């Protein structure tokens with residue numbers, strides 16, 4: 001067919017997979033599989049398949065991929081709100097299938113820059129001065145460069161802050177979220193897709209689950225066959241950045257690639273690993289001083305002479321900026337995060353701190369450009 005919605009539906013149903021558990025095995029609680037889904041939500045083939053008798057459940061051997069059942073346009077029911085786009089995608093979706101989906105089905109215009117935003121997953125408050133600087137800077141760089149903005153895509157934490165900044169052009173804001181923790185996702189499921197799905201945001205009732213962010217434009221809902229686990233989407237989100245990073249769409253096919261910049265607000269020790277890996281991939285990182293938690297820990301050690309970044313100083317900073325969480329940190333963790341922080345500091349050409357100075361008065365766009373220039377050299 002020639003309809004834009006039906007050619008997309010056909011391509012997605014033919015090429016994109018979901019993952020489903022094929023081996024129901026309980027994990028200390030009756031009626032819930034190790035994959036996290038109830039028994040009644042399993043296919044009958046998952047019940048005592050003779051292929052897997054006596055085996056320990058294993059997410060890399062006992063989940064299988066089948067055509068995906070959740071895709072199309074998503075409406076958050078606002079007034080005069082343009083629908084977004086979404087697809088439930090297997091965690092093992094190939095880079096080529098992700099590229100084709102994004103550029104030939106979603107019709108995304110290729111960008112001159114990828115802005116990958118990371119950091120705190122739980123809601124945090126940002127002071128107004130810094131919030132405005134982040135918004136203006138983010139919008140100014142994305143408009144001038146045609147940039148894609150990439151986040152975790154759910155309605156909380158730094159993801160929420162990105163969505164609110166972009167709230168208002170056609171700014172592309174891609175959310176890469178774990179399908180297994182999306183509250184109210186039942187309305188997105190249909191074999192033929194939904195045009196649109198009517199997604200409701202009952203933040204009352206998610207429990208420990210998350211809602212999709214209403215101000216993102218595109219959603220990859222990453223599915224490894226499990227539910228209840230956060231972190232499912234981390235590997236694909238890195239693969240996606242690396243994908244665009246290699247896209248080789250810089251001018252012509254000589255030797256120029258799409259630059260990536262990572263912007264960090266707030267953040268927990270999970271963000272620490274995400275930052276370190278990005279830098280190892282030569283992605284410059286911009287931390288916003290004053291945005292709390294990990295970003296403030298890093299902002300501080302970035303200011304002092306390097307020989308003064310001691311274990312005691314970093315411990316001091318963890319107590320100061322992780323007020324609710326520090327009591328939960330183990331000695332082994334503090335050791336690990338401390339050396340990762342010092343390793344991060346060994347790559348100063350890839351680390352930039354945005355700090356407010358009202359006698360200079362710059363938005364974060366300047367710090368993003370300085371990041372790109374310092375990395376490029």
Ligand SMILES: [Zn+2]
Nearest residue numbers: 021024033035
């Ligand atoms: Zn299962």
